[PDB]
Amino acid sequence: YKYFSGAMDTTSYREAACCHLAKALNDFSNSGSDVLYQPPQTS
Amino acid sequence: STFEEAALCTFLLNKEMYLKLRSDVLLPLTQYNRYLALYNKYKYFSGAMDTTSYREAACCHLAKALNDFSNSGSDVLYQPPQTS
């Protein structure tokens, strides 16, 4: 989904947002530092 | 078949297609006028495909391409607008 070029209403956008959230959580688990989270930016 | 399909379709724009599709039977001039400035807000954030920010954004891009063709006369490929 880091190379996706579709639309926001598609389930692909929701899944990409979930992927970004999961990646942020995984990085937090390996860092343990408070970080600000925002909805994924357009790619 | 419809202007929406023309916006969706990927094709080589030329003099023939420009002359055929410019007719007001498919797109009135009044509707064409409003298709030249709305993308300035839509370019900053995403939107649903059926909403104005995607459909009418692609329509605005197609209208701008038609205006450029009328001011340049160069046959160029038409593609769906790239995501921000």
Curated annotation (Swiss-Prot), chain A:
Signal peptide feature range: none
Membrane topology: Multi-pass membrane protein
Subcellular location: Host endoplasmic reticulum membrane
Function of the protein: Plays a role in the formation and maintenance of double membrane vesicles (DMVs) replication organelles. DMVs are formed by nsp3 and nsp4, while nsp6 zippers ER membranes and connects to lipid droplets.
Subunit field text: Interacts with PL-PRO and nsp6.
Protein name listed in UniProt: Non-structural protein 4
Native species: Severe acute respiratory syndrome coronavirus 2
Gene name per UniProt: rep
Covered range of the whole protein: 3214 to 3256 of 7096
From Swiss-Prot, chain B:
Gene: rep
The name this protein goes by in its record: Non-structural protein 4
Quaternary structure note: Interacts with PL-PRO and nsp6.
Purpose: Plays a role in the formation and maintenance of double membrane vesicles (DMVs) replication organelles. DMVs are formed by nsp3 and nsp4, while nsp6 zippers ER membranes and connects to lipid droplets.
LRR repeats by residue range: 13-34
Compartments it resides in: Host endoplasmic reticulum membrane
Its membrane topology: Multi-pass membrane protein
Domain Nsp4C, residue spans: 1-84
